[PDB]
Amino acid sequence: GSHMSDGLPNKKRKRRVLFTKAQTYELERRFRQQRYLSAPEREHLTSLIRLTPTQVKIWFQNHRYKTKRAQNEKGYEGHP
């Protein structure tokens, strides 16, 4: 059956957005087997959680900067 709305203009020019803890998950796993996704590396994912190739790289950017804060935190956090 037709369970996919192809009307994209029916929406306004605004609407928050996120990712299935799943996407972001595999999509986060890629960052492991690859730290510099490209045009051919990303795609591999685009097969997984469809994060369209470029969209895949566009996401890394957001993490690239934060993926650095994680290492700064990481550890047990607190005072051992």
Swiss-Prot record:
Tissue expression as described in the entry: Expressed in the CNS and midgut.
Disulfide partners: none
Top-rank taxon, per record: Eukaryota
Signal peptide: none
Subcellular location(s) of the protein: Nucleus
DNA-binding region: 12-71
Family membership: Belongs to the NK-2 homeobox family.
Cited function: Probable transcriptional regulator involved in the regulation of the proneural AS-C genes and the neurogenic genes of the enhancer of split complex. Could specifically activate proneural genes in the ventral-most neuroectoderm.
Name the UniProt record assigns to this protein: Homeobox protein vnd
Organism listed in the record: Drosophila melanogaster (Fruit fly)
